[PDB]
Design a protein around this ligand. Structure first.
Ligand code: E8Q
Ligand code: SAH
Length: 352
């Protein structure tokens, strides 16, 4: 009844029809469809009707909702209309070789994730005008690809901070393996404690970390960055964001990223309203994250047998929904990726 209206809305002007199978086994529509959503319990259907995001996410995770066909198409049409220990050995199965956990840059969708992450890093180095003698700080350095490669390519002295023990030990070992002990440092450190390093930097980068800061902490974040920068330095901030302030994902917060906040352009910029930062450039990479998440999901499926041997079926459904729904959010224009290049003080000689 209400179910038939929703199915009708989902199929308006669509070649590939979506259908629903009720717990009784009854189909709506009672004709062949391209994508079938099966509800095993009336409770799971009730949940979706009342709360599509949490109802579908938890119902899919728990196995009450099955999808025959293309999960991305189903998630796209629906979103348009409407504890596990994760070790380095899990991430290595679907991130690229450099273990970069952030948006890549694709000259073309056929580009490999490794090439696209290497290009993304090169574009960041170029934006920062990196040169020998610079001091580079990476706030939220993950598995270290930027602090390691910048030192090897440009002979900068680089420092990364991360909150993850697993990342810290991995980067420590990479520094040793590559003989970079005199050029690269890494610390397990919250950004608020950056002044304790007792150092300033003329180049600062932060990629995929700002989403975890929380809106109530933005002024503290930009004040901290300002205070550890040399006058005339450059700060490249790369974050997922929104075009306008909007609702945050309860499902992502519950299962993937507690305490995350995706800010709008206005929320980012007004965070540093009382500070001597000048805007150099603002870059939008939205569709590149769609392609990044598509490549991650492809590699995830390539290694699905091992991942299942490491985690249960509920985890796999959770992770595949995370990668799929996240990709869709960029595809349909709900989320963006923004790169903001700021100077400390008014810089008038940035190249054209
Ligand atoms: C009869 C009826 C039948 C019809 C059924 C059809 C119904 C079909 C509905 C199914 C949707 C359930 C999935 C709901 C999940 C979800 O919603 O998709 C996650 C997106 C979109 O959510 P939105 O609401 O658009 C933005 C506000 N956060 O959100 C993100 O965060 C994207 C993460 C980005 C990647 C992260 C990588 C690297 C990490 C770096 C930092 C990330 C920080 C993220 C913190 C939040
Ligand atoms: N409050 C905080 N202080 C310092 N680092 C933080 C932080 N909150 C999150 N992070 C770090 O930010 C990183 C997010 S994952 C992004 C990693 C890396 N920049 C890349 O692009 O691949 C992780 O290193 C995480 O530990």
């Amino acid at each position: 009844a209400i179910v038939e209206r929703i199915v009708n809305k989902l199929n308006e002007n669509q070649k590939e029809k979506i259908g629903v199978e009720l717990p009784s086994g009854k189909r709506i529509p009672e004709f062949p469809v391209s994508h079938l959503i099966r509800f095993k319990t009336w409770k799971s259907l009730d949940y979706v009707l009342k709360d599509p995001e949490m109802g579908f996410g938890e119902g899919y995770m728990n196995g009450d909702i099955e999808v025959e066909g293309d999960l991305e198409e189903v998630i796209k049409r629906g979103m348009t209309l409407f504890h596990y220990d994760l070790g380095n050995d899990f991430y290595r199965l679907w991130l690229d070789k450099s273990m970069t956990y952030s948006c890549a840059f694709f000259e073309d969708p056929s580009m490999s994730i490794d090439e696209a992450q290497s290009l993304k890093r090169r574009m960041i180095y170029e934006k920062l005008q990196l040169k020998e003698g610079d001091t580079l700080l990476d706030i939220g350095c993950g598995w270290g690809s930027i602090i390691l490669e910048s030192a090897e390519l440009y002979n900068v002295k680089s420092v990364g901070i991360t909150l993850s023990d697993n990342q810290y030990e991995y980067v420590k070992e990479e520094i040793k393996k590559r003989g970079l002990q005199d050029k690269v440092e890494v610390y397990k450190l919250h950004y608020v404690d950056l002044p304790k390093l007792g150092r300033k930097f003329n180049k600062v980068v932060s990629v995929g970390m700002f989403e975890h800061v929380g809106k109530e902490n933005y002024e503290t974040f930009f004040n901290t960055v300002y205070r550890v920068m040399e006058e005339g330095g450059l700060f490249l901030l790369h974050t997922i964001g929104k075009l306008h302030p909007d609702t945050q994902s309860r499902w992502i917060r519950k299962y993937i990223f507690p305490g995350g906040y995706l800010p709008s352009i206005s929320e980012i910029v007004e965070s540093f309203r009382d500070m001597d930062f000048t805007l150099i450039d603002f870059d939008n990479w939205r569709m590149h994250y769609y392609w990044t998440l598509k490549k991650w999901k492809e590699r995830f499926y390539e290694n699905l047998d091992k991942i299942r041997n490491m985690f249960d079926d509920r985890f796999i459904r959770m992770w595949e929904l995370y990668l799929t729904a996240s990709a869709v959010s960029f595809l349909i224009g709900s989320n963006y990726v923004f790169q903001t290049l700021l100077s400390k003080g008014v810089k008038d000689d940035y190249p054209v």
